[PDB]
Paper text:
In order to neutralize the toxic effect of the peptide on the "producing" cell the genes encoding bacteriocins are generally co-transcribed with a cognate immunity protein. These small proteins (typically 88-115 amino acids) interact very tightly with a specific bacteriocin or pair of bacteriocins and protect the "producing" microbe from the toxic effect of its own bacteriocin. Sp-PIP belongs to a large family of putative bacteriocin immunity proteins. A combined structural, genomic and proteomic analyses has allowed the identification and in silico characterization of a new putative immunity protein from S. pyogenes.
Here we present the first structure of the protein from locus Spy_2152 (gene names taken from S. pyogenes M1 GAS), named pyogenecin immunity protein Sp-PIP, determined at 2.15 Å resolution. The crystal structure of Sp-PIP was solved by the single wavelength anomalous diffraction (SAD) method using selenomethionine (SeMet)-substituted protein. The crystal asymmetric unit contains 78 (out of the 102) well ordered residues and 74 water molecules. The first methionine and the 23 C-terminal residues are disordered and cannot be identified in the electron density maps. The four long helices (H1, residues 3-16; H3, 23-41; H4, 43-61; H5, 66-79) pack tightly together around a well-defined hydrophobic core. One additional short helix (H2, residues 17-22) connects helices H1 and H3. In the structure, the N- and C-termini are very close together (7 Å). Overall, the protein is slightly acidic (calculated pI = 6.06) with two large acidic patches near each end of the bundle and one large positively charged patch near the N- and C-termini. The structural comparison results suggest that Sp-PIP is most closely related to Imb2, from subgroup C. These results suggest that Sp-PIP is highly likely to function as a bacteriocin immunity protein with similarities to proteins from group C.
Residue numbers in the entry: 2 to 79
The structure:
């Protein structure tokens, strides 16, 4: 479960029309992916993406594109 796979999974989520259409989630994902790219992965960052993706999933009543669930899965693993 590598630093790059998570970064790519973030980018996949970021590119989603429903994420692009929403200024809070778009920027949030953008910031987390930049922190990862810059500093690498961490416990903390894992926690932050987890919280953001939980928030996205719950806010949308489990109606989220596959990539969101894919990302969610990856950061849940660690």
């Amino acid at each position: 479960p590598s630093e790059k796979e998570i970064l790519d999974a973030l980018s996949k989520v970021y590119s989603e029309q429903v994420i692009q259409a929403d200024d809070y989630f778009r920027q949030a994902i953008f910031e987390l992916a930049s922190q990862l790219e810059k500093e690498g992965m961490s416990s903390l960052l894992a926690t932050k993406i987890d919280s953001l993706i939980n928030q996205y999933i719950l806010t949308h009543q489990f109606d989220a594109p596959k990539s969101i669930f894919d990302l969610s899965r990856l950061v849940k693993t660690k």
